[PDB]
Structures are given as C-alpha cells and as structure tokens.
Amino acid sequence: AGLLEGKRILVSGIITDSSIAFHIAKVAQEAGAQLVLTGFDRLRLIQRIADRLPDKAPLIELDVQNEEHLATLAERVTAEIGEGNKLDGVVHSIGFMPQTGMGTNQFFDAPYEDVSKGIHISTYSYASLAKALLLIMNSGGSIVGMDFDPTRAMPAYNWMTVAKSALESVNRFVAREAGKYGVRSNLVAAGPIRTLAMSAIVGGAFGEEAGAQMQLLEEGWDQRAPIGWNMKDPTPVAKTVCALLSEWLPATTGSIIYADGGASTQLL
Amino acid sequence: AGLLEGKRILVSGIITDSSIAFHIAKVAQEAGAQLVLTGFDRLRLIQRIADRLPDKAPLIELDVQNEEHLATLAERVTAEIGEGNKLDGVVHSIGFMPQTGMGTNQFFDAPYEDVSKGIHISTYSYASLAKALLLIMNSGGSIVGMDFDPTRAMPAYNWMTVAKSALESVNRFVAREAGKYGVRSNLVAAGPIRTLAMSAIVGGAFGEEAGAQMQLLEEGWDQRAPIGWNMKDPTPVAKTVCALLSEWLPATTGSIIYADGGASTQLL
Amino acid sequence: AGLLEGKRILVSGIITDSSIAFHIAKVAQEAGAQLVLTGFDRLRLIQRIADRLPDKAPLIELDVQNEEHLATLAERVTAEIGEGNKLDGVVHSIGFMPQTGMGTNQFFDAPYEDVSKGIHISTYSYASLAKALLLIMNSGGSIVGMDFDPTRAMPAYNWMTVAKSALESVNRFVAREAGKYGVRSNLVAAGPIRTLAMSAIVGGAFGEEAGAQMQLLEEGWDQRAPIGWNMKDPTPVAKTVCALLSEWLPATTGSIIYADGGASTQLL
Amino acid sequence: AGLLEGKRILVSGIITDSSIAFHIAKVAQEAGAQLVLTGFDRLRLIQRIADRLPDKAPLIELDVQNEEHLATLAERVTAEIGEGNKLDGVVHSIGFMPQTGMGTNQFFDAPYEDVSKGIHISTYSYASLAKALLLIMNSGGSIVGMDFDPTRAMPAYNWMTVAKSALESVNRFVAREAGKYGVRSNLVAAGPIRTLAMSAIVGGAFGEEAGAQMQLLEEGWDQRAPIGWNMKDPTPVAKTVCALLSEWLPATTGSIIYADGGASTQLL
Numbered sequence A, B, C, D: 001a002g003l004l005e006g007k008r009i010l011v012s013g014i015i016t017d018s019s020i021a022f023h024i025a026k027v028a029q030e031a032g033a034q035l036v037l038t039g040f041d042r043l044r045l046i047q048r049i050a051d052r053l054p055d056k057a058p059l060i061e062l063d064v065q066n067e068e069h070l071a072t073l074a075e076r077v078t079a080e081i082g083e084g085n086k087l088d089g090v091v092h093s094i095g096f097m098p099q100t101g102m103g104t105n106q107f108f109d110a111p112y113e114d115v116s117k118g119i120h121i122s123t124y125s126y127a128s129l130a131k132a133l134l135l136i137m138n139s140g141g142s143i144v145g146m147d148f149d150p151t152r153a154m155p156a157y158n159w160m161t162v163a164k165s166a167l168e169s170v171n172r173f174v175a176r177e178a179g180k181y182g183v184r185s186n187l188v189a190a191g192p193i194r195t196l197a198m199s200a201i202v203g204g205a206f207g208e209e210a211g212a213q214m215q216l217l218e219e220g221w222d223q224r225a226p227i228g229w230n231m232k233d234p235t236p237v238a239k240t241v242c243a244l245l246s247e248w249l250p251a252t253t254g255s256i257i258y259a260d261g262g263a264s265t266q267l268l
C-alpha cells in the first residue's frame, strides 16, 4: 500500500533486535518492500532475530572483508530475488572499530592494523558493497549508508570518528559511480542510539571514563535537539532511511541527511 | 492518498505557472493535501494561475512586508480551513532582491535600502511566516523554505546570495521556536530552475549577452550533478519539499536538504 | 623592527580599552604599523582611550550608516597619511544589534527595522568600508573583519548570529572585488571576549536568562578548546588579525581564520 | 630573524627540489629557523637535494610505516639538536596513494591493501609523528600537515581525496593530545602545485591525453581564486606553513588554513 511498494531492497547490518538495521528492515517491510538480508558471522543469531520481522526475507552471508563473499554477492542476491529481477535499494548499516580504537585506549595507542580493519569495515566496504550491487540495481535506485557527524572531534569515539570522515568522502565518490546507473548514494547521520554495544559501552565496557563521556554526549544531544532526541528509539532513523529509499528524494546524492533531532544545527 | 493525505498545507509564492511554488502545490495536491495558497500583489494574475492546479484552494493575500497582513494571517487561514482545524505544513517559497543587488550592478553599487528590502522579503519573512502560523500548526507539522547554496560566492547572484546565507541562519533559529510546538523547520536548497524569475534575472542581466549563459548554467550543472539535473523540470524539487512536509523525515530540523542533483557535493 | 613594519593600516571599532580593536591597534603598533583610527559617535571617549596606545595615530570620524562619512573617507584618510601614500590594511571591528534582537526578547519579536539596522552596521558595512578604501589600498593589501562562528544557532545572540552569517557571505563577495586590487579580504572568528558590553550582558543587562546562557557558553568554550580559551584576554585575537595583515598569509582570501582556542573543531 | 628566529623545527617530506616540503624548509631557514630534516628511502638522493638549501641541517631517516623508525625518532632528533633542547615545530609534508587509487583505475578497482597503505602514509602517520615528537616539543609549539580540500569529490584524486578526509579528522584528534603540551596542530590546505608528484600523478594518468590537463588545472584555479594562483610557485604555501609555525596564530588549533588563493570560497 505504501512508501516502498514493490521495491526490492537489500539490508545489511542486522545483528540483534536493537541494531538500527533491524528497524530499517521492519519499517521497510511495513512500507511494502521485499527484502533480502545480509549478515556477517553469527548467522544463527541473525536467523532467529530476522525471523521476528513482519515478513520472511532470505538471509545471505556477507563478510565485507571477504573478497569471495563480495565476488558472489550479486549472483546470490539474484538467486534470492529471481533472475531477471534487480534491486531498487541497498542499505549499508555496518561499522566496527577494534577496542584499541575507541574508548579509554589513548588515541595515539591504536595500532594501524586495528585502525585499518576498522576503516576496511566501516568505510571502504561502502564502496565494495556499491561495486558488487550496482550491476544489479534498477535506475531510480538508492544506496544508503549509516553515518554519524564526524565534522568535529570528541572523546571516546576516536578512530571510529576518523572512519566516519572517510566514509563521508567515499559516499561522494560512490555517488559519481552510482549516478551512471541512475542510482543515488547518500548517508543518514543518526543521533546516538542505544544498541547492545552502545549500552555496554555506556556501562563502561571500554573503560568508565569513556562510558561517562558518552553518557554526557547523549544527555547534551537531547538538550540541543530542537525537537528532542530519544536514544532508545531507532524508528525516526529507520523512517529517514526509507525516505531516501523512496522516490521522494530523487534529486539528492553524494549527500548526508541528518536524522538527529536537529542537534548538529545548534551550538547549545 | 499518495504522501500528504489528510494534510493541510499553506503554500506561499505562486506568481507564474513557472514558479517553484506552483509545482510544489501541484505535486502536493496530487499526493492528497488540502492547500491554502498565499499571494502578492497581482492577486488577479495569480488567481487565474491558481485555477490551473489539480483541485480548488482558498487564495489569500500576503504581503510579507505588511505587518498587518501577517497579524491577520492565522485569522484568515483558520476562517478558510475551518475553525478547530490547524495547518500541518507551511511552504515559504518567496524571494526578492532589487536588480541593483543582482547581476546588473557591481556588488558594491547596491544601496542598502535595496539590500535591506531584499533581506526583509527573502530571509526575515521566513521567521515572520513562522511567527504568524506556528500558533495554528499541529504537532508533527513541518515548515519548509526554498534556498540555494550560498556557502561559496559566485557571479551575479550577489546580494541575493547574502540573503540566502541570512535565510539559512534564520532557519536554525526558527527551528528552536518551532520545536516547542513539535514542529520541524527546514530548507530545500534547489539546483537552478528555469523559472521566469531566473530567466530574466540572469541571463538578463548580466549580461545582455545571453540566454545562452542560462543554457550554459543548465549544461554545467547537469555535468556537476552525479545523477544529472534538468533545469526545465522542478518536479524533483517539489517532491523533495513534499518529503519534508511528510512524516518520513521526523528527526530532521534546522537543516538543509539539497535537491540539486548532488552538484554541491562535487568540486567538478 | 617587526611583523607589520612600514604598513599603514586603518583600524575601526575602538570604543573602550576593552574593545577588541583597541588590542588589534596596540599589537599592530608594537609590530611597527602606522595607524589611522576610525571612531563612531563618542569621539571624546575614543580620543582619550586612543591616547593610551603605544603611539599617537590620527582619529577620524566614521558612522558606517552615514553615506557622507563613507563618501569622504578616502580623502580624509589620504589627508591623514599624506597624499601619494596608500593603506596596506583595513580592520573592520564593528558590530551592533538593537536590544530587541539579542538576549531575552523573543527571536520572533525583533522588528525588522531593528534587525535591518543591525545588519546595516554588522554586515553591509563591511562591503561599504571595502568600497570606500580599496581605491586607496596597495597591492598585497589586507582587509580583515571580526566574526563569530554562526554556522549553528544558539541562545541569546539571536539576530546578531544572523548578521554574522550575512557578514561571512559578504566577505566572500568582497574578496572578489578586493582581488582585482591584489587585496585580500578575510574574517577572524574570535572566541567570546569580555568587552564592556559582554560583561554587562553576562551581568544580566539583556535579561538574566540571557546572562546565564552566555555564562554557560563561555564556560563550555574554554572546556572544548584543546588549548583553552581566556575570555579576558583579547591578545591572541589581536595577534591573529595582525597575521592576516602581514604578508605571511598571502594566499588566503574570502576565508575565515578561527582565533577561538580550537573550540569550533570539538563537539565536547 | 625574519619570523621563525630561534625556533627549532622538524620538516619531513623532501623527495625532490620541487617538493612542497623543500620550499617550506627553504622559507623557514630564510626566516631564522634551525631545521632537522626527515627522509624516505632515497636518503642519498634527498641528501644531494637537501644541500641546495640555504643552511645546513641534520638529515634523518623516517619510514613512517616503520614503527621502529618512529620509536627512535625523538631519540635521534634530540641527539641531533642537542640534549636539553626541544622542537618548536613539526611539519608533516607526506603523502602517498598507489596509482590504483588515483586517476588511472576506476575508483572501485582499487584493492583495499593499496588504499590501506595510502591511508597509513597519508593520514595515520600524522598521529604517529605527533605521538613520537610531542614529548620533545616546547609549549607554544606547532604541528602542521599538508592537506588539500576533500569536502567535495572530483576526478582522479579518488582514494587520495578519501585519505585527506581522514587526515582532517585525524588532525582534530591530534589537537586534543597536542593541547596537553601547550602545542597547536593544524593543516594547510594548499591549492594545486606543480610538484613532480603532481605532474605525473595526473595528468599522467589519467589520462594519457595531457599535461595539457595539468595546465588546465592551473588556468581554472587562477580564475576561481579571487587573488589568483600560480601553480608553479609554492612560496605562498610555504609562507602560510611558516605563519602557523610562528606565534602569530596562537589561538588556532584542530583547524585548516586554506592557502589556495581563496578558490575554495567561490563556486566559480
């Protein structure tokens, strides 16, 4: 009946029911989309979580650092959606920085191999997902990735912030490639969301000083946001992703849509 | 029934059938919205224009420089949508800069009285409109204004560019006020569109040389834009406005959505 | 002996010994510059304040809203520096917003005539100072204005923030005109400084809620600044202005240099 | 005696007499600085290069990918400037991206190992250099790196542009660490300069067509720049670096100074 009626959309990045991708998928399905899901390592976990979505969607394995997974992805998706059908959307909702690159650990103490792995997964992979799927996307199509505003430095997020600055740069280059297919590429810069990992972090999993810093950042965020911000509700974020997946933002690419309560637009 | 269904939306700024506001209004009605229009000094001319829209809408006089028009706006809007009803959306599609402030004269030769009038109409009035209408707006509502990207300077647009810089600033403050009513405020930064105001502005003039320069703007922007840009078609811009009038961008406020083909994201 | 040896520089905007222009002038003089000073209305005040600078400098009257003052400025300066000599620098250190446009008074309650006067003095005047003086500036010359970062909205500063967004846009256009003379135009975005007016404001001159808000902003500023920020010391700001007035930033124009402790580069 | 007098400054990144670092070093010595140089793998080649500088400087081996070189850097620098002496300045003038990541190959065809190496050398190493040298830097000291503006995407520069995006992010975090020693950290975003790395990069290639494209970059940037731009002359860039090494920008950190003729501030 709705926003994404008849669109075929791949959604990556579901790990638990609190993953922002889980909510992107739920809202996408409620809006009439047919999904193909992608998951990384804990596939039995992902299967039982994904089984709680509004409707069943095939689940495909994808480790973004695995060249063979990427090489086979388009065939695997085409098998899953039916030959002669293509994708109208791709959601990249994936990120990771080793523990040395976030929290307590001194900014200067992250080894490059840790940083490099974080940038592989968190940035480069946006270009490799695009490289793999563009050949099977329809004109009018939409690639969307998850971002957080890295224009300013901050405590705790450290090398993950750097990875996001790279990711934003990648998005602008992907947009040049995607545009040849009549496909758009954009990021959604969310406000902070209480995933399992972020709850653990605030709980002090990466040191308590880091937990305390993120707690302040979260409180300040809701204060700054002219419409407020609820870090326990990824729905407004999922809806924004769907807006980009729809045809109602046909002239936007290489860009960033801030789904953050308007916090980034206010000093205080 | 097709995005804005059940929504009551005020749309200002129709002067010709080429007006961006005209297309905003057309697309909005196609998508199920009940409109109230607002117009200038040629209420006859714009009434003949307005009747060529999909369905019928009250048409209302608003001189934004007329503090009387503004003091009675909420009064006249409520009479026309019916008591006990509020607005869900407000579109500011109003610009003006005297020719002295635009491609003719040297930048330095515009008298402040001319600039001050342009800033009044182009930027201040966004806050005036918000002041007048916020009190009869529903929670979850949306105010949108038309912008163009003034982050870098450029030939000809001169003091109108300055007025867009002021407008973007005015927008972030409006969002603080609007947020108290649960209402969002955003700008759409459009790529260039061949409205009658644009064709006339510049080209003519500066220079004199060209409507060729107009055509040249068209060809260079299409190239800059990863997904291309059709200056003759403001439908993509009108869709972007309608996305912001909808509930699909519920967490974005004080912000600017670029409906410019992605040109702003590319150096070339 | 030093940075600005043999340069002739006009400095506007001295009102008291706590004016940021007073410190710009002091540091400029200590660095070997010959000044011409400009003052607005309280010339006897300005005379006795200016008499405390390291060396004597002629003082000229300039009301930036007075067309006759601007029309005569270049002749008056040339009389003061000697015919056949030109300026190597111009410092615009001037700003003002009526009380309705800052503090307690609702953002929406500032009348346009108040706003317009603030933008006249705070923004447009940067272009009119440039229009008046460029004809008497040497190649390699430098125009510098005072800014504060208005990229985000904030409590209290209200319409003055809007005026600064306009001022930044003006600077980019002035740079296009100045470049024809081989002159640069740049702004320095300072951190908050305790002038008389800002002390009075924090003391509650514009309402106590506004005072309290600015006090927080000041405290947060020093916290965010990786090198700290001392709001009672305009010297680091004056030095930055002199850097721009020197030949050590020969390839920078239409731009903004942040003399703010690095605060704008940090979220927290 | 002419800006940097008495200052001890480390300068990395000399490979040819056309290197930006070479001109930084020349100008810095002209302005009274005692230099320590740092070099690659052609220490013979760069020693013959280095001797053509104004005065004599220790030359030191630094492979930034060599965690051993980095662990002994502060050791080897102190031996060479003398015990009980510290550095006042550090210049990072290092870039690398394999050709696969630059105008040759399609953006998507660069393998991550190549990108990861480029990011290592171009962006991560700014933090590595800071980690190694901060401990022997004086209060009031200054770290500067070379950047180019990566806010918008563009032909050819591809993953090197991504690496500059990462670098600007890395810079704001370095400034948080540097601030503890009373040390500033900033980037100079230069306009394009006809170094041997640039001429070769692209032009050749892509395309093949042209060193004409090189010349075209030159002519278009000069036009974009309000004060013009001479791609054959890196003196203006070297002066800007030296301004940041001086005490005349004492309140700026985590920031980017644009020494690009002001091109970045103009749409065209």
Ligand SMILES: CCCc1cc(C(=O)[C@H]2C=CN([C@@H]3O[C@H](COP(=O)(O)OP(=O)(O)OC[C@H]4O[C@@H](n5cnc6c(N)ncnc65)[C@H](O)[C@@H]4O)[C@@H](O)[C@H]3O)C=C2C(N)=O)ccn1
Pocket: A012, A013, A014, A015, A016, A018, A019, A020, A021, A039, A040, A041, A062, A063, A064, A065, A093, A094, A095, A096, A121, A146, A147, A148, A149, A154, A157, A189, A190, A191, A192, A193, A194, A195, A196, A197, A198, A217, A218, C267
């Ligand atoms: C406070 C100042 C900075 C701040 C930070 C934030 C945020 O960090 C926000 C803003 C953006 N995000 C982004 O959403 C995305 C989804 O994460 P998110 O949903 O937040 O976390 P998770 O649920 O745990 O999902 C991470 C997924 O990743 C997958 N992953 C891991 N490695 C693999 C490889 N090798 N292959 C394929 N997939 C990979 C893993 O399996 C998970 O499914 C991600 O890009 C986040 O960075 C997540 C937010 C958060 N609060 O959880 C917003 C505003 N500001």
Ligand SMILES: CCCc1cc(C(=O)[C@H]2C=CN([C@@H]3O[C@H](COP(=O)(O)OP(=O)(O)OC[C@H]4O[C@@H](n5cnc6c(N)ncnc65)[C@H](O)[C@@H]4O)[C@@H](O)[C@H]3O)C=C2C(N)=O)ccn1
Pocket: B012, B013, B014, B015, B016, B018, B019, B020, B021, B039, B040, B041, B062, B063, B064, B065, B093, B094, B095, B096, B121, B146, B147, B148, B149, B154, B157, B189, B190, B191, B192, B193, B194, B195, B196, B197, B198, B217
């Ligand atoms: C080339 C680089 C420069 C730059 C410029 C542009 C543009 O200028 C785009 C970007 C934004 N716009 C905006 O849309 C809006 C509508 O424009 P547009 O629809 O193009 O012009 P108009 O049709 O003539 O609409 C202006 C309206 O205003 C109203 N108005 C005027 N004064 C009075 C007052 N005193 N009383 C009440 N009404 C009045 C007037 O009556 C008109 O109805 C406006 O804000 C524009 O500035 C219109 C553009 C265009 N190409 O037509 C995009 C990208 N880059």
Ligand SMILES: CCCc1cc(C(=O)[C@H]2C=CN([C@@H]3O[C@H](COP(=O)(O)OP(=O)(O)OC[C@H]4O[C@@H](n5cnc6c(N)ncnc65)[C@H](O)[C@@H]4O)[C@@H](O)[C@H]3O)C=C2C(N)=O)ccn1
Pocket: A267, C012, C013, C014, C015, C016, C018, C019, C020, C021, C039, C040, C041, C062, C063, C064, C065, C093, C094, C095, C096, C121, C146, C147, C148, C149, C154, C157, C189, C190, C191, C192, C193, C194, C195, C196, C197, C198, C217, C218
């Ligand atoms: C906290 C978030 C926002 C925030 C705000 C701030 C600031 O407001 C900063 C940053 C920039 N400034 C700017 O410096 C400039 C100097 O002011 P400043 O020196 O701060 O104030 P004053 O000493 O009182 O000087 C104002 C002058 O103006 C003159 N004036 C008044 N009308 C006339 C006309 N008609 N003609 C000619 N001259 C005019 C008047 O005579 C005074 O000499 C000014 O542009 C300020 O806006 C002054 C700061 C301050 N803290 O005093 C920085 C960082 N962030």
Ligand SMILES: CCCc1cc(C(=O)[C@H]2C=CN([C@@H]3O[C@H](COP(=O)(O)OP(=O)(O)OC[C@H]4O[C@@H](n5cnc6c(N)ncnc65)[C@H](O)[C@@H]4O)[C@@H](O)[C@H]3O)C=C2C(N)=O)ccn1
Pocket: D012, D013, D014, D015, D016, D018, D019, D020, D021, D039, D040, D041, D062, D063, D064, D065, D093, D094, D095, D096, D121, D146, D147, D148, D149, D154, D157, D189, D190, D191, D192, D193, D194, D195, D196, D197, D198, D217
């Ligand atoms: C046209 C739009 C694109 C864009 C690009 C540009 C530029 O690329 C400008 C802007 C910035 N730069 C930067 O200066 C710096 C020096 O460049 P540049 O001096 O141009 O190149 P090089 O002379 O060849 O210097 C690179 C040095 O690095 C060193 N290096 C390399 N790897 C090794 C490791 N493993 N060991 C130790 N040393 C090594 C290498 O030995 C060289 O000494 C660098 O960061 C550049 O990216 C140099 C530019 C230029 N035109 O030459 C400006 C505006 N716009």
